Design a protein around this ligand. Structure first.
Ligand code: FMN
Ligand code: SF4
Ligand code: SF4
Ligand code: SF4
Ligand code: FES
Ligand code: FES
Lengths: 44, 429, 215, 264
């Protein structure tokens, strides 16, 4: 059971200017070995 | 079989659509998400595609393409290249907010759908290209992804399946053309949001020059609930070739605008009056309606009554469903002005790499401003029609079709208004 | 016009303009680049450039050149991106950039009233800044808030379903050092109808419900 | 037999290797499809959409510059749909094109003129105001007048793929897309004067040869270069006993279509 009379997405009132990127950083810990073409770049 | 109108909450698929329950993992598990995904994964991918097919699920991006066949163009042997899945969240189509609602109020469904479709296609990760104006939504999404990585539902052993899967989010920097399968990919790759041609097809060579399958938020968010409850259940909703529970967004000149899920092939008049509070003044004051987004032709009150809000009926009504963003106009509107603002929007959001849109859309915007003023002669309406038809099927993408269609609708149902404006301008001189 | 798509050097915007990333921004950049394959690191251009924009507030030419240097890309491949995408600010903007939606889903619902009330309260025009360098008003296209219209976006936050009184409140608050609550200014909290919940007022069924057998 | 496949061009049949495009086949039967962006030595780009043809029993038109050819396809080069597509694309190209032909060094040798006379209409229903673009300054060799750019991207693809500079691009989007650099920068490589040759619309022109003549006057003498030891093939245009310019020739073994600035 719950209230069902309010709004449970009131955390976005507290997001900083750098939330998305701090989250991506903290997330890197779980990321997986990335593929590799076989080069550093197309050498543009 | 008939009267596809009402839909019970037992069958509603986006339960936290209004931010009434916790959007985090506790509410997701408590509502039916991340349940049995292990068995869904240990089942073969061909079974997931069989479900997507026997469900009749058609994409919601704006074009009515069956997923199962789309996602089955990608169920091939690998050639030593990583396969990917790109989720389209760049809902810049006027009148459309459903994807925002999903992203911010039930993102674990989107994540689970990423994982399911990834196992279906053979993918290695899910790139969720999200609009850049949606910073809070993307942050909620990354929070959900962190929760999932912590719980072990995505990553090295996704739910205990031997299948390893990542989920990346990507912001877009505010462009509507980046919503196309291909310009989306170019943006991700770092280049401008300039679409590429077909062939090649994203399944053969797509993002990072690898196989790819682009899909809308709603599609993937639905996929696990289909695989879990059954496609036949999803196919009992709506008509034969078009089936499912579709999100709706009712905006403009309506007293209670809202977002809703319903049975497809529903009567539009019901969809409005029952869920919204009907047009501001009453059905009689309804001038015209845009059934889908801005990329869909108008239809006037006459046919808006007996029209079923699905793909095929709207096609037979000389319009289309698109994203199902019902824009309503009453008799107090300079409809010419609304369509001209739509053309100005398409003029701003054009990428500019193929001549027809680049030039003719600005051409049509100028002509439409002139029609608003009435400085034109009624012999120019057929010129504008011919211009639209020269733009329609001669472009790299659909944005040209989307810029040409509302003009065709305006001229197909509201020509006398334009001629009367011209007559008044001639009298004023 | 205002969006010229050319760059003529000035004392404020030249290659020698003093831009550089912070040691935190560099680690965020490393992570971003890690979000893409090893051979394809020229795909971080957009996030790294928006990051620089966040740090500096806007984007001078030196910023793009440094982004390129970091990613080892040609700087023209970054000029193209910056010019193409509109979220990237190549002129200094105010503390609070106000993007008003004026497409038909919002226009229909009297958006020009809000545009005017902002033109007056602030003492600026449709595309100017303030002497205080705090406000900046512009017209933009659908922001995915078509149902909670009218609406405006102020530095990564939305303010929806508002009116002249509400926007006046928001502006009186931003001029006092406060940051208001993003969301509809009417009773509704989100896209839910105003009268009352007409779709999902029941409780949700919860786990194992509707599940097909043989799975 | 050796992976070839049968294909038709207005009935006439021709066997083409796989991956071959509609354009290359129509050429293999002697037909030249219009073009503003395909150059036979540069990455494909389906921008101008002037290569549009209809395929028998197909609803829409394909870009012959980029669509590979499939078995049994019949390609209708001179049908109503193709003609009307060309006419529309010409209307669009000339909508914002400046009335500069009599001050454009490209007059008489402009692909836009000839393709408008051979594939487009003879009228303008544009009753609006054109645009204009502030000209660049990329050096003393190439004169830039960008009101005449039809945004074909040849200059960009050439600089990137053949010269290796990667300093040219497209700034902006929409109808206000400005090809060129974003900053003042001299584009002085040793294969720079060929961008003049591949720009069909006089936006990029030789500053030396500026205004000095017109193509019909010139008499064209086939000779070779001597500045280097490669033996680049060239055409020497003369006008009343006077060298007016040096223009390359085609030799797939030496100088396919290029020459150095020192040579020209
Ligand atoms: C100009 C343009 C904008 C588009 N915007 C979107 C969009 O915002 N969201 C979307 O899901 N599809 C959009 N599409 C449709 C894309 O083709 C989309 O990636 C694809 O249809 C999604 O697959 P689905 O419809 O099978 O889910 C757009 C297409 C065009 C031409
Ligand atoms: S139609 Fe417009 S947006 Fe689409 S590819 Fe052509 S120029 Fe770009
Ligand atoms: S400047 Fe010339 S070569 Fe370059 S894109 Fe324009 S028309 Fe093509
Ligand atoms: S490029 Fe061709 S059509 Fe344009 S002004 Fe020069 S000669 Fe005339
Ligand atoms: S039209 Fe204004 S948010 Fe969509
Ligand atoms: S020749 Fe095909 S689009 Fe230009």
């Amino acid at each position: 059971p719950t209230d069902t009379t309010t709004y449970k997405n009131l955390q976005h009132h507290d997001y900083n200017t750098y939330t998305f990127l701090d989250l991506n950083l903290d997330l890197s810990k779980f990321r997986l070995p990335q593929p590799s073409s076989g080069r550093e770049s197309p050498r543009h | 079989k008939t009267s596809f109108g009402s839909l019970k909450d037992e069958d509603r698929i986006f339960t936290n659509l209004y931010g009434r329950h916790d959007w985090r993992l506790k509410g997701a598990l408590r509502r039916g998400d991340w349940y049995k995904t292990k068995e869904i994964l240990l089942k073969g991918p061909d079974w997931i595609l069989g479900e997507m097919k026997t469900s009749g699920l058609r994409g919601r991006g704006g074009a009515g393409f069956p997923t199962g066949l789309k996602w089955s163009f990608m169920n091939k042997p690998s050639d030593g290249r990583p396969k990917y899945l790109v989720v389209n969240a760049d809902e810049g189509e006027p009148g459309t907010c459903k994807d925002r609602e999903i992203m911010r109020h039930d993102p674990h469904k989107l994540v689970e759908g990423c994982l399911v479709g990834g196992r279906a296609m053979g993918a290695r990760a899910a790139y969720i290209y999200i609009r850049g104006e949606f910073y809070n939504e993307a942050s909620n999404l990354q929070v959900a992804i962190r929760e999932a990585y912590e719980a072990g539902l995505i990553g090295k052993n996704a739910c205990g399946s031997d299948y390893d899967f990542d989920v990346f989010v990507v912001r877009g920097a505010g462009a509507y053309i980046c919503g196309e399968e291909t310009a989306l990919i170019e943006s991700i790759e770092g280049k401008q949001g300039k679409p590429r041609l077909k062939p090649p097809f994203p399944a053969d060579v797509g993002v990072f020059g690898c196989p790819t399958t682009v899909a809308n938020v709603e599609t993937v968010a639905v996929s696990p609930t289909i695989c879990r409850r059954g496609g036949t259940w999803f196919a009992g909703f709506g008509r034969e070739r078009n089936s499912g529970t579709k999100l709706f967004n009712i905006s403009g000149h309506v007293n209670h605008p809202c977002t809703v899920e319903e049975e497809m092939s529903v009567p539009l008049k019901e969809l409005i009056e029952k869920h919204a509070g009907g047009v501001t003044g009453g059905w009689d004051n309804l001038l015209a309606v845009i059934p889908g987004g801005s990329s869909t032709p108008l239809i006037p009150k006459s046919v808006c009554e007996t029209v079923l809000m699905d793909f095929d009926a709207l096609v037979q009504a000389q319009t289309g469903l698109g994203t199902a963003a019902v824009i309503v106009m009453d008799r107090s509107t300079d409809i010419v002005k609304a369509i001209a603002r739509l053309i100005e929007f398409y003029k701003h959001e054009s990428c500019g790499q193929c001549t027809p849109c680049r030039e003719g859309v600005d051409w049509m915007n100028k002509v439409m401003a002139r029609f608003v003023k009435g400085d034109a002669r009624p012999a120019e309406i057929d010129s504008l029609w011919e211009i639209s038809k020269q733009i329609e099927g001669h472009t790299i993408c659909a944005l040209g079709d989307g810029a040409a269609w509302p003009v065709q609708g305006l001229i197909r149902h509201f020509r006398p208004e334009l001629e009367d404006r011209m007559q008044r301008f001639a009298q004023q001189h | 016009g205002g969006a010229l798509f050319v760059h003529r050097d000035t004392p404020e915007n030249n290659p020698d303009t003093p831009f550089d990333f912070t040691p935190e921004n560099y680690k965020r950049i490393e992570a971003i680049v890690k979000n893409y394959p090893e051979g394809h690191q020229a795909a971080a251009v957009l996030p790294v450039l928006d990051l620089a924009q966040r740090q500096n507030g806007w984007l001078p030419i030196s910023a793009m050149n440094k982004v390129a240097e970091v990613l080892q890309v040609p700087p023209m491949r970054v000029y193209e991106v910056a010019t193409f995408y509109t979220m990237y600010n190549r002129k200094p903007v105010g503390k609070y950039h106000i993007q008003v939606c004026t497409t038909t889903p919002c226009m229909l619902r009297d958006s020009d009233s809000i545009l005017e009330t902002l033109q007056r309260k602030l003492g600026i025009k449709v595309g100017e800044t303030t002497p205080d360098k705090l406000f900046t008003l512009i017209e933009v296209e659908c922001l995915g808030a078509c149902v909670n219209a009218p609406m405006v976006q102020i530095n990564d936050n939305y303010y929806e379903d508002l009116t002249p009184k509400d926007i006046e409140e928001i502006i009186d608050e931003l001029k006092a050092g406060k940051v208001p609550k993003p969301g509809p200014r009417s009773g509704r909290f989100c896209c839910e109808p105003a009268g009352g919940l007409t779709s999902l007022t029941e409780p949700p069924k919860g786990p194992g419900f509707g599940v097909q057998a043989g799975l | 037999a050796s992976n070839l496949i049968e294909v038709f061009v207005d009935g006439q049949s021709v066997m083409v290797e796989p991956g071959t495009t509609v354009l290359q086949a129509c050429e293999k039967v002697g037909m030249q499809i219009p073009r503003f962006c395909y150059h036979e030595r540069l990455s494909v780009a389906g921008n101008c959409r002037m290569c549009l043809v209809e395929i028998e029993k197909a609803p829409k038109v394909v870009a012959a510059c980029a669509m590979p050819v499939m078995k049994g396809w019949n390609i209708l080069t001179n049908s109503e749909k193709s003609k009307k597509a060309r006419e529309g694309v010409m209307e669009f190209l000339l909508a914002n094109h400046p009335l500069d032909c009599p001050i454009c060094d490209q007059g008489g040798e402009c692909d836009l003129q000839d393709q408008s006379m051979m594939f487009g209409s003879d009228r303008s229903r544009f009753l609006e105001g054109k645009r204009a673009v502030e000209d660049k300054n990329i050096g003393p060799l190439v004169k830039t007048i960008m009101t005449r750019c039809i945004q074909c991207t040849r200059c960009i693809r050439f600089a990137s793929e053949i010269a290796g500079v990667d300093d040219l691009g497209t700034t902006g989007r929409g109808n206000d897309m400005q090809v060129g650099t974003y900053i003042e920068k001299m584009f002085m490589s040793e294969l720079s004067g060929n961008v003049i040759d591949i720009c069909p619309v006089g936006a990029l022109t030789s500053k030396p040869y500026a205004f000095t003549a017109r193509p019909w006057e010139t008499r064209k003498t086939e000779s070779i270069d001597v500045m280097d030891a490669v033996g680049s093939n060239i055409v020497v245009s003369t006008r009343t006993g006077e060298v007016m310019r040096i223009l390359p020739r085609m030799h797939e073994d030496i100088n396919e279509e290029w020459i150095s600035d020192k040579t020209r």
